[PDB]
C-alpha cells in the first residue's frame, strides 16, 4: 500500500482494435502477435509517479499512483457486462484500429454509450488510433480522425501496441486530465 491515489481507467472499442495489447505494452512492455480475444473483462495494473510540473530534485514532490486499467471485450455478446463497468471508471481510453475503417466509424457510437453510462455526461476520454506500425494496411486518414477528435474536444494519439509508440503519452494525458479534475473539485 505504498502509494497515494488509486486511479481507475477503462479501455473500450471494437473487438480486435488492440485494447488488450495497448494495455499490456504499457504495463509490461511486451506484445503478443497472436489474437487472444478477451473473455468479457480483464484488468492490468501499474505503479507510477505523477509529477504535474516536471522532474523534482532532492525533495520528492511526486504523487504515487496505482493505476488499475480495465480491459473490456469488444464483442457484443459481452456488451452488457462491459457497459456495467463504465460507471466506475474515472477516465476512458477509447480505441479504434487504423487499418479498420468500420472501427473508426463506430467511435461516435461508443462515445454516445459513455455519455449515457459514465459517471458524467462529459467524462475524460483520450482517443487512440491503434496499429500505426501497419502503414501498408492503413484505412483511416489521420486528418479525418483528428477532425472527429476535434469535434468532441478529445485528445487524439496514433499508437502502436507493437512497439509502444505514443502509448505512455496517451495514458499519461488521461492521468493528467483526471488529476486536474481532482484539483478542480
Amino acid at each position: 500500500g505504498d502509494y497515494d491515489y488509486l486511479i481507475k481507467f477503462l479501455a473500450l472499442g471494437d473487438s480486435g482494435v488492440g485494447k488488450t495489447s495497448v494495455l499490456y505494452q504499457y504495463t509490461d512492455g511486451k506484445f503478443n502477435s497472436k489474437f487472444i480475444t478477451t473473455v468479457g473483462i480483464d484488468f492490468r495494473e501499474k505503479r507510477v509517479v505523477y509529477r504535474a510540473n516536471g522532474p523534482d530534485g532532492a525533495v520528492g514532490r511526486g504523487q504515487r499512483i496505482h493505476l488499475q486499467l480495465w480491459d473490456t471485450a469488444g464483442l457484443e455478446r459481452f456488451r452488457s457486462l462491459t457497459t456495467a463497468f463504465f460507471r466506475d471508471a474515472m477516465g476512458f481510453l477509447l480505441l479504434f484500429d487504423l487499418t479498420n475503417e468500420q472501427s473508426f466509424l463506430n467511435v461516435r457510437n461508443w462515445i454516445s454509450q459513455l455519455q449515457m453510462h459514465a459517471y458524467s455526461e462529459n467524462p475524460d476520454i483520450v482517443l487512440c488510433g491503434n496499429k500505426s506500425d501497419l502503414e501498408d494496411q492503413r484505412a483511416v486518414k489521420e486528418e479525418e480522425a483528428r477532425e472527429l477528435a476535434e469535434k468532441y474536444g478529445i485528445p487524439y494519439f496514433e499508437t502502436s501496441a507493437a512497439n509502444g509508440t505514443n502509448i505512455s503519452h496517451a495514458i499519461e494525458m488521461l492521468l493528467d486530465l483526471i488529476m486536474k479534475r481532482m484539483e478542480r473539485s
Binding site: 500500500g1 502509494y3 497515494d4 491515489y5 488509486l6 473473455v39 468479457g40 473483462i41 480483464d42 484488468f43 495494473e45 496505482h66 488499475q68 457486462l81 474515472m90 459517471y119 481532482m182 473539485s185
Partner: protein, 52 residues
C-alpha cells in the same frame, strides 16, 4: 466445463482479483488518518472526491 461455464469461471477470477485489490485499497485508506489529518487531502487520496 462447457464454454458458457468456462467463460463465467474466467470472469469470476478477474472479479476475485479486483476484490482483493479493493480490500487492500480500503485498508490503505483506513490508515491514512495516521499520517494525514487534513480532511480534503483525505477525500482526494481516498477517492471520495470522485463520488463528490
Amino acid at each position: 466445463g462447457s464454454p458458457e461455464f468456462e467463460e463465467q469461471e474466467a470472469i469470476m477470477k478477474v472479479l476475485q482479483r479486483d476484490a482483493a485489490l479493493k480490500r487492500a485499497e480500503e485498508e490503505r485508506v483506513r490508515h491514512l488518518p495516521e499520517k494525514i489529518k487534513d480532511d480534503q487531502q483525505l477525500k482526494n487520496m481516498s477517492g471520495q472526491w470522485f463520488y463528490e
